[PDB]
Amino acid sequence: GAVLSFHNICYRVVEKEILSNINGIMKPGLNAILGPTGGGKSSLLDVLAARKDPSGLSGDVLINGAPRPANFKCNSGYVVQDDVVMGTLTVRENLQFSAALRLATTMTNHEKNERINRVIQELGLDKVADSKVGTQFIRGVSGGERKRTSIGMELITDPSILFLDEPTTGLDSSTANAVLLLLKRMSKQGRTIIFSIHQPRYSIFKLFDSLTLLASGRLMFHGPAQEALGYFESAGYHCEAYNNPADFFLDIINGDLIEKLAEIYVNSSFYKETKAELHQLSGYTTSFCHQLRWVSKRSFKNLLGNPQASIAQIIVTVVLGLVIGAIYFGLKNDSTGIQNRAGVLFFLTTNQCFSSVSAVELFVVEKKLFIHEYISGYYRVSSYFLGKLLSDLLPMRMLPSIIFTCIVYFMLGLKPKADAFFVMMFTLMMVAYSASSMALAIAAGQSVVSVATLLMTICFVFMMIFSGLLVNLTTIASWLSWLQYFSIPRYGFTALQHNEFLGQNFCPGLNATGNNPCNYATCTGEEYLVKQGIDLSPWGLWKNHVALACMIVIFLTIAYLKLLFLKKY
Amino acid sequence: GAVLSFHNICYRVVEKEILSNINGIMKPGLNAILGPTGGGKSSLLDVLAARKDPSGLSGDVLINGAPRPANFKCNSGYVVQDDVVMGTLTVRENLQFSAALRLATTMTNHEKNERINRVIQELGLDKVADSKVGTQFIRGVSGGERKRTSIGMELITDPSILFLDEPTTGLDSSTANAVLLLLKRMSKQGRTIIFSIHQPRYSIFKLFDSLTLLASGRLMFHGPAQEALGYFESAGYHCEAYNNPADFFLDIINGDLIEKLAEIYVNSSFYKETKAELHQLSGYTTSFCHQLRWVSKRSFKNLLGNPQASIAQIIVTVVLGLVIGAIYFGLKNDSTGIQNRAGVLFFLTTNQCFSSVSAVELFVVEKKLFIHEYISGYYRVSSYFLGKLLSDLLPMRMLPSIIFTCIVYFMLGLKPKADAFFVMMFTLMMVAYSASSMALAIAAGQSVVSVATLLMTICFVFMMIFSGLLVNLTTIASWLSWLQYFSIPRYGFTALQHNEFLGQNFCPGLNATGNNPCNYATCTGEEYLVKQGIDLSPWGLWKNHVALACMIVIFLTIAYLKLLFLKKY
Numbered sequence A, B: 001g002a003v004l005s006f007h008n009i010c011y012r013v014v015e016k017e018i019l020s021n022i023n024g025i026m027k028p029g030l031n032a033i034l035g036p037t038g039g040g041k042s043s044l045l046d047v048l049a050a051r052k053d054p055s056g057l058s059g060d061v062l063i064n065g066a067p068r069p070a071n072f073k074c075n076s077g078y079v080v081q082d083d084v085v086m087g088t089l090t091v092r093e094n095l096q097f098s099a100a101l102r103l104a105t106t107m108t109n110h111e112k113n114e115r116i117n118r119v120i121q122e123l124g125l126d127k128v129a130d131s132k133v134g135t136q137f138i139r140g141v142s143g144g145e146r147k148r149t150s151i152g153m154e155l156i157t158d159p160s161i162l163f164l165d166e167p168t169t170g171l172d173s174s175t176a177n178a179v180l181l182l183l184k185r186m187s188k189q190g191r192t193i194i195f196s197i198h199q200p201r202y203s204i205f206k207l208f209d210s211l212t213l214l215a216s217g218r219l220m221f222h223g224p225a226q227e228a229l230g231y232f233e234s235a236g237y238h239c240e241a242y243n244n245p246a247d248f249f250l251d252i253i254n255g256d257l258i259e260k261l262a263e264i265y266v267n268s269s270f271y272k273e274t275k276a277e278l279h280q281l282s283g284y285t286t287s288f289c290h291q292l293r294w295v296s297k298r299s300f301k302n303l304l305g306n307p308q309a310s311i312a313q314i315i316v317t318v319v320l321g322l323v324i325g326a327i328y329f330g331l332k333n334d335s336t337g338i339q340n341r342a343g344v345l346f347f348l349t350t351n352q353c354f355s356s357v358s359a360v361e362l363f364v365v366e367k368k369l370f371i372h373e374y375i376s377g378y379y380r381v382s383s384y385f386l387g388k389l390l391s392d393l394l395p396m397r398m399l400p401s402i403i404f405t406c407i408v409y410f411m412l413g414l415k416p417k418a419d420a421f422f423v424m425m426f427t428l429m430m431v432a433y434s435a436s437s438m439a440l441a442i443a444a445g446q447s448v449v450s451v452a453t454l455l456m457t458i459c460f461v462f463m464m465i466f467s468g469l470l471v472n473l474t475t476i477a478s479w480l481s482w483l484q485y486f487s488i489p490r491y492g493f494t495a496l497q498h499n500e501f502l503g504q505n506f507c508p509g510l511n512a513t514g515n516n517p518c519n520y521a522t523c524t525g526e527e528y529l530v531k532q533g534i535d536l537s538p539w540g541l542w543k544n545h546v547a548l549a550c551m552i553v554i555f556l557t558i559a560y561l562k563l564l565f566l567k568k569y
């Protein structure tokens, strides 16, 4: 099988050392890593799996007599403590996704289906193959079945070496025993299993083949688990009956010293033998389009399977549209036309902007899953970005603009032409895309959602002040005027005003005989636009969409560069 | 000491029964309640402590031979699974609060200080008496010390009977052993301790005096913990060595049936004896002002000790004020005066309204603590309400109005009089109070903050539409006009407009010789007000503050009635 031999490890993580001097050999079977919570057990596991940065590593990890290959992460499985499976998807769907992106595309779909069937049969999930996994807060298969599902996702590719972080934490005692019996059955086949656990039971402990006890980043013991109790008893720490030996081992460390125990081990017979053995030993699959298609498919299934959020936004949009159509019904070309028109346009623009602060959750929620799957070799950092946008961003943001315009444009009696209807729709869509893109840029590469939401809201109100309606931008002083070019709402609102007010007359029965509206009237739409600082040329309408497009590109590029330089280790 | 004898309990919680037929006697010592998670162990604990509604209870709880007194909850302590201590306060401060509200006011402060010193010495917290407890996510004393602090808060009043829900869950093994040794020391004094635990160790289990095993709402065993293993072994379920007997007992239930075990117990020698014994046995301190003072003091200390949130809001307010003063600097009485004035007033009003959706967290965050302390007899439901308002609501909402007005009123060149400055300040303060009150009304008596925040934002935008600026309320149709009287921003904005536009002239060099501004000019402020639908009489300014005050009263009363009828059991 495989023999993962680590020798003289020292990891320095501010320069702290969480693993000091750890050497051992993990032969095939069911190997273990025990110790207190603060001990470097998960850290050692990651070090052996190469899921940790090589910066601090100061030792030689050597598998089956040769240095670790570059494709080790891809050829070896790793199971997370908290399952990352997609609740909205069916078990077989998740297994199909993993098979699609990990296994070679040369394999035909029939062969992959056979492989998935084999794995499902082995884990014993055949009954619940076609059932939704569930969020573990939402209803679905049981927690043990979710854990089995994760194990299967990693088992698709026939891994020789398999790592497991806390396989039994949060599971019930019966479920935990079931999981570990399953792992023992897997190990009898020759697959080397390496895992870390917390507070095991003697029924569990009786199944181990090797034991690695860690405390405060030091090696208290490495050897067969059966002989560990004899070793400690020989050291003088006698054990009482009806006491789980694992608890006794932890108790010795707790003191109910550490360097003394480490030296005792160094003088053991299990250390010189291990030294002799170690001295003897020492001296992308898939194309870009495939990744994009599958990640987009998974995202769309997640969107449909959990429709509570999207449906609510659609409902709110429709209700607001029907209310606004009734309130502003029958806009008139009289003294009060200007106020109502400007007000409705302002409201639509700001509603499109402030409703886009819900895009911060697009990447924040799925951060751990993204990191795990990138390290495991599922996909590139580009395909994830493009697919997630194409699935979760384009349609949701493209809908509200269409709904609003179709509902309100003819109830309100706005311009009766077709050239203007689609300009309005396009303008609103671009505003929404730009605002959502700015949200992604700020919120990308973060795990906390609160701060990003606060920042987004503050920035948007500051932008909204510098829109035309509230301040008359021609009045603002020079040393603060330039801030208006950094406003998303300004461009959209200006475009809508240019589209609507060009041609209207708001003076009933002027008769223009004296030709004098008293110069303080605002009798015509063009006069209002010029007094507001807007340009009546056609370029004045499109120099706003140009800016919105450029802002979209800039923000999306920033978000990509933030995901690409994120720390994934 | 005390002998809490329960007999023939049946609790029906939709009519489900989670406790079927449970009888037992809990003599002085260190008694226990074990079983699986789904078993009614916490439910039984609450039933014995009277923290559960008497509706479902169908049995006789009898303490020391007499029915439970009405003041039982006050004379008996109860410790929650998740500690509710205030992190922002020092240990001694929390103990002082509990002593102030639980112990009689007749006791002098010197005696109470001596009592607190005794308790601190007993628990062994003397070293960390003057250290902040911490949130357990923020730095502070260790988790074990927080648990000891809770135990002390309950131990202030010298309870004869003491209840503990999961005293050791989340604690480290060494810390758990320390806590339980402390409880054993307390029990040797004659105090009857009753507690529920999960997955104990044999070191812990060796300390028990009585055992009560529950599974699926049925009594598997009640008797001395020492004899339990012999009982089960006699039943045929032999036990292996190096296995914790608690785990063996749970394993028997897991099956690695229940009615069979219950019948076996009914035929036991520990059941007839208990029946014989049971048959033998059967056949506000403080004034309102004190409560208000102390709850307000605690709230203020919590506000100062965690200043990250308040400081940020103050900073945002100041920054916005200084930006707005620069943008709108030197308002002129010309064609563009009306727009800028109306815009700034609108912005200030809506900023005061939308910034008050952060008040939903005032009561949502401290819901569990409020319920626990009300049931324990700390305070009334009125004193908590008034004190929490007086501490957390009045100052925070009263500051921003003052800051905004003082900064901007003279930079913008608004009315140069004093009568108007304070009208503006008062108007803004009332708007903020009314909006925050409406937030409290909706969010009161809830544990989830998301839904309330969404509702608040939606209601506020709907209100903002019906303000004067965007819609010209004189245009709206009759069957929808009446919705304007339910708008908080409308009243404030109308008041500010009435205060500012009354007397201004926005037509430079009219010369009024022909006396014709063309009737479409809006040459004067009064003309703008009347065209907007506002009343120029002085009553038109104050009929808005009257409405705001009435809304404040209505919403606060609603919130109180929602807290008073909340389910606390």
Ligand SMILES: CC[C@@]1(O)C(=O)OCc2c1cc1n(c2=O)Cc2cc3c(CN(C)C)c(O)ccc3nc2-1
Pocket: A350, A351, A354, A355, A356, A357, A358, A457, A461, A464, B346, B347, B350, B351, B354, B355, B457, B461, B464
């Ligand atoms: C339109 C008034 C105002 O622009 C202002 O000038 O003062 C401050 C402020 C405003 C609007 C909004 N907010 C504010 O703080 C928060 C907010 C949330 C909104 C939401 C909820 N977002 C947080 C996504 C909507 O769905 C639609 C419109 C929304 N409008 C606003």
Ligand SMILES: Nc1ncnc2c1ncn2[C@@H]1O[C@H](COP(=O)(O)OP(=O)(O)OP(=O)(O)O)[C@@H](O)[C@H]1O
Pocket: A013, A018, A036, A037, A038, A039, A040, A041, A042, A043, A044, A081, A165, A166, A196
């Ligand atoms: N990236 C890091 N930065 C700083 N300290 C770290 C980092 N990774 C580990 N450590 C430290 O190394 C020590 C070991 O932590 P460790 O990972 O082993 O926790 P664990 O409880 O044993 O893991 P698990 O519960 O998942 O099995 C800790 O003190 C931890 O703070």
Ligand SMILES: Nc1ncnc2c1ncn2[C@@H]1O[C@H](COP(=O)(O)OP(=O)(O)OP(=O)(O)O)[C@@H](O)[C@H]1O
Pocket: B013, B018, B036, B037, B038, B039, B040, B041, B042, B043, B044, B081, B165, B166, B196
């Ligand atoms: N107010 C309630 N409404 C509905 N069901 C309830 C209520 N209180 C308890 N139950 C039910 O009674 C059963 C027992 O739950 P229980 O309180 O004992 O959980 P527990 O794990 O044992 O408590 P703990 O962990 O804190 O020690 C559960 O099925 C629970 O859903």
Ligand SMILES: CC(C)CCC[C@@H](C)[C@H]1CC[C@H]2[C@@H]3CC=C4C[C@@H](O)CC[C@]4(C)[C@H]3CC[C@]12C
Pocket: A485, A486, A543, A544, A546, A547, A548, A550, A551, A554
């Ligand atoms: C760099 C980051 C922070 C994003 C900021 C980009 C902003 C400031 C840039 C991006 C593209 C720019 C626009 C590009 C084209 C023109 C047309 C010109 O006739 C007027 C200015 C205008 C309208 C620019 C204004 C500033 C602008 C909107």
Ligand SMILES: CC(C)CCC[C@@H](C)[C@H]1CC[C@H]2[C@@H]3CC=C4C[C@@H](O)CC[C@]4(C)[C@H]3CC[C@]12C
Pocket: B485, B486, B543, B546, B547, B550, B551, B554
């Ligand atoms: C239960 C909730 C919705 C409370 C909101 C109640 C509102 C609708 C009530 C409370 C007090 C009321 C005001 C009381 C006094 C007057 C003066 C009168 O000359 C005009 C109406 C006006 C201004 C009322 C309008 C409606 C009003 C503001």
